[PDB]
């Protein structure tokens with residue numbers, strides 16, 4: 327058998343599902359063996375795959391988070407564009423089948439998808455319904471309601487009211503799209519490499535300052551980057567938790583309480599109605615430099631991932647959105663949204679209203695490094711070391727240096 331190495335960043339429950347998908351494909355035919363290899367968080371996984379390319383130890387497939395897309399698109403010669411791979415191997419590829427938001431987010435300026443969609447998400451407001459009920463609180467729709475609900479929870483003895491993971495993705499990137507404000511110039515990077523950051527504005531700053539002020543009295547508690555704060559929610563310590571829809575699998579298995587999810591809170595001091603939320607998660611890039619049989623097996627595995635049944639199973643088990651309309655329709659016909667209330671929140675929120683350039687998503691080179699900058703500066707806010715105005719100004723300044731570095735090399 328010819329092995330197809332797939333380096334990915336799926337840990338915990340979702341990682342076990344990756345291994346089930348690969349092995350199911352391996353059991354259906356006798357020519358190709360997909361070998362999934364966990365390489366760490368998204369940054370570690372992308373870094374590892376790129377570093378391996380010199381020693382020719384790089385995988386056939388690498389999962390690269392949405393953040394890394396501009397960098398991967400500029401890495402011409404390192405990637406095998408998926409449409410060319412599929413045609414070369416004799417496998418179908420129909421980009422139009424993917425959700426419109428996925429297509430608009432990932433397509434090149436000429437309308438081509440270079441990578442294979444797989445795990446797309448958006449942030450939702452997770453909540454402990456048991457704790458809300460005991461506190462006499464309601465599911466919030468606005469930021470004022472988030473604070474009031476947090477107060478009721480803590481008054482009723484909850485350790486803390488609200489927290490969030492992936493804080494830049496949630497409280498800067500998605501917060502901006504949800505309120506139709508720009509994240510950077512040149513249409514959040516889609517219109518040019520000469521972009522600069524625009525999130526250092528009064529709307530974002532005032533919200534971050536408001537959250538920091540909730541630390542007193544434990545209405546808010548910071549619980550770290552990425553998914554580090556997950557056990558705060560599943561242990562029943564915080565009653566509200568904003569993070570990826572893709573925590574559904576972990577939450578369903580680890581939470582001893584009744585849980586729900588709803589759309590992100592609206593900051594009514596910024597807007598009277600929400601816009602839409604934006605993509606998170608990753609896509610699958612095929613790397614150059616391998617042989618024909620390795621690519622044939624890669625293409626056949628991508629076909630296995632393209633089926634509505636596999637896409638629906640992945641969505642149902644993880645909380646990543648159904649990546650195609652067909653997978654959504656299959657899940658609906660199976661009664662999944664009736665039997666599991668709220669699992670259609672993420673797909674609805676991505677397409678809530680006709681998008682604007684501010685709500686398409688983001689495309690910034692070196693955004694892997696900018697993500698660290700933004701997390702560092704937000705941590706300075708939670709620690710009381712900087713105001714949000716100063717922290718965001720520093721994040722935009724440091725981020726702009728990274729954008730200029732990318733622009734200089736992308737020519």
Ligand SMILES: O=P(O)(O)OC[C@H](O)CO
Nearest residue numbers: 391447495570572606607
């Ligand atoms: O937890 P995920 O896979 O939905 O990813 C969250 C963010 O989009 C990562 O940048």
